[PDB]
Amino acid sequence: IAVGMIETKGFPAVVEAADSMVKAARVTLVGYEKIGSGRVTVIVRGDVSEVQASVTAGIENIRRVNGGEVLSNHIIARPHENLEYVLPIL
Amino acid sequence: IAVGMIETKGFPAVVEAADSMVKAARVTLVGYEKIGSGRVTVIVRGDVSEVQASVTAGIENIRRVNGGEVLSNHIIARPHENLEYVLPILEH
Amino acid sequence: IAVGMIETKGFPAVVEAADSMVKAARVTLVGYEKIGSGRVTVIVRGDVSEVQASVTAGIENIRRVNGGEVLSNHIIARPHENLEYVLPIL
Amino acid sequence: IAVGMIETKGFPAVVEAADSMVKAARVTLVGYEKIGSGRVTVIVRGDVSEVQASVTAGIENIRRVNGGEVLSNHIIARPHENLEYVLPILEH
Amino acid sequence: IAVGMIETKGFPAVVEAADSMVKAARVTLVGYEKIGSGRVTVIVRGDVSEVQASVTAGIENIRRVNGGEVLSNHIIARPHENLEYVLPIL
C-alpha cells in the first residue's frame, strides 16, 4: 500500500525510472503524471520495503540516461485512503 | 467552511502535502489544481482549526521530501459562497 | 457592467483575490482563467465604483498570502458587447 | 479580409487589447489564442484601415494596464484563404 | 510530398509565416502545432523546390513582424510514410 514516486525533467528519463522500478522490486506501476515545465512523475505501489527498493533502483538508473535529470522523489509507506481518488496515485 | 491550500513545485511534494493534511486533522481533501509551470496546489476544507492544523503539518512535512519545494500556502476561514462555483475549491 | 481582473502567479493567491473581491463590494465573480506559466486571473463584474472597490481590496489582501504575487490587474468600466462571448469574462 | 493580432503576456491586458480594438474601429473580434507561457493573442478581422486603427489603439491602451506587456503585434491586409482552416483566425 | 516547417516564439509570427509560405510557392498549409513555451510550428507540403521557396519566404517575412522570433525551421524532401499518421504533418 506504500506509494513511491520519481519526478524527472524529461520523458525518456521517466520511462527508465518506471522500467527500473518495476524490475527491481515487487511493486506495480500505477501512474504517470505531467504538471508542465517538463516535469513528469511516475508512481508505483507495493510493500514499503519493495517500493523502497524500486525507488532506489530508478534513481540510480536514471544516470544511465543521456540527458537524464531527477527533480524529486518520495515514498509514503501508508497513504491515507482519501488520497486514492483525489490524486492520480491509483 | 474554511479552505486551506498548499502549492508546490513538483508532484511528489503535493502528494505528501495531501497525505499530511488529511492525517493531521479532521479535514477533507477536495482537490488538486495545476496551473502550469510545475505549480500544483492541494486543497482542503474543514473547521478553521483543523484546516490550520492540516496546513501547518503539510508545510513542515514537505521539507522531508527530496527535491520538495513549497511555493505558497493559504487559508481562508470563511470563504464567500461565490467562490465555490467559479474556483475549483469544492470537491473535484 | 464593469469588468475587474486580478492576475497572480500562484493559485492560492488567486483564491484570496477572489474572496476579498466579492466581500469588499457589490460585485460578482464570473471568471477564473489560466494561461500557463503559473498565471491565473480572476474576473468580476459590477458597477465600476464597486468593481473598483473590489479590485483594490483583492490587491491589498494578496500580501496576506504567503507566496503571494500579483502580476497584473485591470478594470474596464464599460466593456464592448463583443467581448462577452469571445473572452471568458462572463 | 485583413487580420490584426495583439499578443500579450498576461490575461487582463489581452482583454483591454480586445476592448480597445473593437471600440476604435469597425472590426470584429474573432478570437483569443493561448500558446502557453503566458502568451495570449487577440485577433480581429476587418478592412485594413479599420484593423490598422484597432491595433494601434490596443497597443497604446495597454500601457495603461498595470502589469501589462505587449509581446508582438501584426497585421496582414490580404491573408491567403489557406490560413482560415489551419490557423484559428476565423471566429472561434 | 516534401514537408516544410517554421517554428516561432509567438503566434502572430506563425501566422505571417503561414501566409507568406502559401503565397510564395506552390505549397499547401497543413499544420499548426503548439508544444508549449510559446513555441508554435506551421507546416506545409509541396514539391521540395516549392516548399523550399515557401520556407525561405516565411523566414524572410517574419522580420516584418513586431516581436517576431524564429526558433527553428526544417524541410524534409521525402518524408517516410509512417510519419504521416503519427505526426500532425498531414
Place this chain on the structure above:
Amino acid sequence: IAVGMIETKGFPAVVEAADSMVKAARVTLVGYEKIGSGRVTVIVRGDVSEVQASVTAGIENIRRVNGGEVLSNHIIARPHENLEYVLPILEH
C-alpha cells in the same frame, strides 16, 4: 520489444528525428509525447539492434536542423510489460 526515444526542444526537430529513425532501420514509430516547455519525445519500438541504429541516426541528423536541439535520448532493450499500459510507449 526494445524502445528508443529522442527528446527535442522544438517540433521540426522531432519530425526529423522521427523521419531519420524509421528510415535508418527496421523499427516502427509508435508515438510523439509532449510534456510542456517545448519538450517533445519521439518514440520507436523494434529489435534492439534496429532501435539502436534508428536512435543514432536521428541524433546525428538533428544537427542538420536549423535551431534543432536534442535534450535527451534513451533506449531500453527489454522494457517491462507494466510500462505499456501506464506510459505512452505503445502506438498512440
